[PDB]
């Protein structure tokens, strides 16, 4: 048998390499520069013709197999990471394209929360997906993904970033190089996704619980004057050469408060583990609260982590969560592997167990023979 | 323009001797290192400098206007010296491009305006896009294509190069004539 | 290739996919007679070898070594292959003036063999986790085996004999508080030059570093030599074991190789009328052709045609003379003469005929595009035959219809 | 809980309705579309017309096979991963749990109340599943009224107009001086 | 007999590698009549 | 047994066709090695 390969197709980056390695091999933009386009298009889009979709993977799966991996595809098998609840003609289309042109041995479809929970060694463990497009949590007992107490917030990248365009374009200062030494506001309509993203992770970071507490309710004016901490020094980005836009320092420690802010509705990326916690069974609440797992990309972001489980302990303190969540001891786990490749290094590890790994995957036979891939909608 | 080459007319002025075209308005300051074997074209305002040269170019080689084809010097700590370039057969340096390449290959075709670093080797059937710039001391392999400011593998080219390229520079130098 | 637009006429493929591409890109296929694209064709893996410095590799070594060079090195900064300067050798990238002194890795006494990337932080943890999932991945395979066997014998579980060394791995600990956001981050200038991008942070995936003083110099990526192999035919194209500083193929095989390329030599006007000159020249030495066919009536996938394009033109016999043949150097009769056509052919110099096609514009806003058939006399030799021993008459008499779709400037 | 699986199966198709008031949407597509197929297993082997719905904004959703996989659920929650009996079961279970003597008659009279009852083939399929458990050659009829919803109130509205109310219910005075299980005992 | 279906599939594995063997003889060796061609090439053309 | 006796003799013989056909391809290689490094001398020769 040979080393099975490991591809995690996401909306923001893709995680490729081989079974039984310390980390993933290539990690690029999920992208594909076709000739015409000017902006390369994104190649995981869910709601679009199958057709559409079938050919951008086709594209993609290419340069994985060949420009980032150099391996025959038909040769050995894939172990496919995808997160739970992944749109069905996405993931139905994902393997045909891998069964049909490339001829696969066999695929794996491993939900990424389960993978996670591997790297560690814990048979049992809450696992927080902090990604692009939406931050999913999803309580994994002893190999169980328990589907019943799910839940899922558009509070990712995604969001992060429309949410930093919209603050940059409000107190807009852009030295442009043209008698533009004075403040110019939106000299460009639109900032490309690829700036935003640079920007968010070099100069924006997530505040502490107590000034972080003051910044919401300093920028909503709450019947007070002047209720803000002070802020870090504006620094200066450039913008494609010459023109340089001067990041207001309220920006970077504000922008990342839309994930941790209540909005009324009682719903943060912090709240989402204690209203999964809570619908959890009973027996299982001490075992899942002790062995907290946080991945996804968003969540790398500079004091995140102390964040989350400082906000955790407050939203504990609140009169929903007191009585059920009250007297808890809520300990998070640091993984092998850095928080954006510890889905990756689940399926690697998987991928490593040659044994148990052809029996669990679906066979390119089965799937000529039946057309119809296992998922956990009805059969 | 759709796979025909266009026609192009000259003036009076040029140097045609033994198939060889140089344009008159073009300066090739060091006329007896520099070499042109085959039947070349050096279209006008161009440069070709001997400074300690020796500039053998191609059968149907093509270089368009504003273009410079300069010799690297060598930081050796023995001696520093001028490395003498050897452009390959049927080569197609593009217009106003900047050229301080060491062993330029054959059936190349280098973009327009594209600066190639000091010293550097450029394989067999390869082809650099316009507004590109190769670093000093780059290697680029047969079938590939160069581009950014970094200047870093873009791609492949198609299977069929080296039975293409000579067609492009045969036709552009017969299509090519007086007025 | 790009110079003259070959990305403007294209060939249509046979099969399950309908795609549209320049014959430059295309492949013909000889086993069978069927013109197939780069995309419809499987790939396949030959050799390795880095862009730097050309050395092929074999599959066993680049497996150990991560499909990387040991001796090259690719900057972390911007993305390009580093240079060993001496003063004791340091590592420095020309485009960018970032050197291996910047982030304060030593100078090394020999050359090569001295430098070296850090091992994995958590590579002993790993070892550990996989050693214990295999034991435990072989139980399973033991108890789904027995299970398995069991329902094969269909005994019901019939106690014939009696029925029924452990590797513990220690679960990670969980911290009680994780490290807090250092005081610093507050009140201090960001320089954006000591924090590193998110392009170069992810270049270095299994330890990716925020300071720029941490980001070590990756080994440079190996790249591929592709061999292409159909479905219904086996062989197809490949490369040579020498594929570094050379450009010869193994066995050379493409569409403008055996198929008549068609090129528009002259584009007249775009304004609701014109007569546009194309030529057709033949590569095959001896051969027939005829672009006769007008594309039928809603057949073939018609739907780009915005135009109706005549052609009304018999078949024209071509011949390619593999010599430097001089300026009109003789003049067949049969050939050329007989045939004069004046209307239809344009010129017939060497391995070429220019043909007048009339072309209705303007039929939609903009974007004038014209559907046409091609065919042309294939000696496929598919039958065994060594320089041309078998007649071929039956081979010759197969007329191959090319779909193609040219797409004038407009 | 229909409403809420009818969520995760939509996110499964690709529309999420993350919101609280986005919520009450997917609970407006089950009350519009979804259909309780006889056979479940039938229905997910033949292909789907993808049937259009129309939100409050104007755009479209094909909601697909997540519209009879949703409502399943009722008639076997251990799909999801919820341990209840189910609908068919806790019918039959209140039947058989009762004297041996009622039984017949209480198969024999079954009344479907609420509004969890109005899904499209509903007392179709409770029929079907209620036979194979219930005991062979026994008469079961499903016996819904046409005002499902409006069952519960209109059956107070008979009960307070008629003078035996008067005796039933319990005065402010009474509650005052009895105490508080004067409510309870009352009740029944 | 558990040894008979073993012996069996690995009688059938091994003519599975032979069958593939055979469809690479095919495909190579007309690729090596190509190359057979391509080498008289090489010598007249190490002449020339 | 006496049946995948027979097969298994077969099987025998098979593999032994397998060292046969493995034996000709990889000397049908190296003879198109030295092919090649015959065409490696012409490509020399055509560099000088
Ligand atoms: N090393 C990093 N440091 C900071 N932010 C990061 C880092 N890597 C990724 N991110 C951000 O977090 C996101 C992580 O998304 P990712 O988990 O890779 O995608 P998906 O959820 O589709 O699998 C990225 O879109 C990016 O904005
Ligand atoms: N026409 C309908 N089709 C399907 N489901 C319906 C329909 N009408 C109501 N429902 C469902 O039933 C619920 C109404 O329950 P209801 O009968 O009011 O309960 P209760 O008896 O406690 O008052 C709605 O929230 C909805 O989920
Ligand atoms: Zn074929
Ligand atoms: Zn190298
Ligand atoms: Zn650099």
Redesign the pocket.
Known sequence: EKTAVVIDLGEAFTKCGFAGETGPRCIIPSVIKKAGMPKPIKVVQYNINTEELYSYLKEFIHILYFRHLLVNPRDRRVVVIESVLCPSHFRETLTRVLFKYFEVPSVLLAPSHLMALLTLGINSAMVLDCGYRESLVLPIYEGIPVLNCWGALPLGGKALHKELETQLLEQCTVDTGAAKEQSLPSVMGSIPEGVLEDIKVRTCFVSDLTRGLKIQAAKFNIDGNTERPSPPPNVDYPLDGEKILHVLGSIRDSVVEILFEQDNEEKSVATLILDSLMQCPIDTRKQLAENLVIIGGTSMLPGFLHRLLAEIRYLVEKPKYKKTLGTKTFRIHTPPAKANCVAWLGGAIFGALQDILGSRSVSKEYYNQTGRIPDWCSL | MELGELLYNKSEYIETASGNKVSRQSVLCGSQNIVLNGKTIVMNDCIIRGDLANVRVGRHCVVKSRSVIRPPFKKFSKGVAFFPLHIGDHVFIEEDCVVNAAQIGSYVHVGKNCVIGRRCVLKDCCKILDNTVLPPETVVPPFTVFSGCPGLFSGELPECTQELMIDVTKSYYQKFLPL | ASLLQSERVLYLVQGEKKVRAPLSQLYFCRYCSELRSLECVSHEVDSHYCPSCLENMPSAEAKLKKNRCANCFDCPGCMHTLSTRATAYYLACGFCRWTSRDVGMADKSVASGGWQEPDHPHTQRMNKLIEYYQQLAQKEKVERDRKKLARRRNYMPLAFSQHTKEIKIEPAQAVDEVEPLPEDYYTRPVNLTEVTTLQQRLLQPDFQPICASQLYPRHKHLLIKRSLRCRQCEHNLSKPEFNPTSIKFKIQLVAVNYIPEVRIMSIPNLRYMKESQVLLTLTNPVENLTHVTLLECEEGDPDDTNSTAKVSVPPTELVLAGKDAAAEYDELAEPQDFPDDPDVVAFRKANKVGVFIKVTPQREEGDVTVCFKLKHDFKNLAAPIRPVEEADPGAEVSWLTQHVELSLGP | D??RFLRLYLRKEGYDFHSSSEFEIV?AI??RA?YLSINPQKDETLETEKAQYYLPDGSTIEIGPSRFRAPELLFRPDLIGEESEGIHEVLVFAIQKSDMDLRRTLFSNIVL????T???GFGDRLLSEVKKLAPKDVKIRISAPQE??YS?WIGGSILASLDTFKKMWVSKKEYEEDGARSIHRKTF | QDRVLILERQGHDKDLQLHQSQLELQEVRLSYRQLQXXXXXXXXXXXX
């Open positions: 229909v409403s609970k089950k009350e979804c109340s609420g509004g969890s109005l899904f499209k499902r919803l519960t």
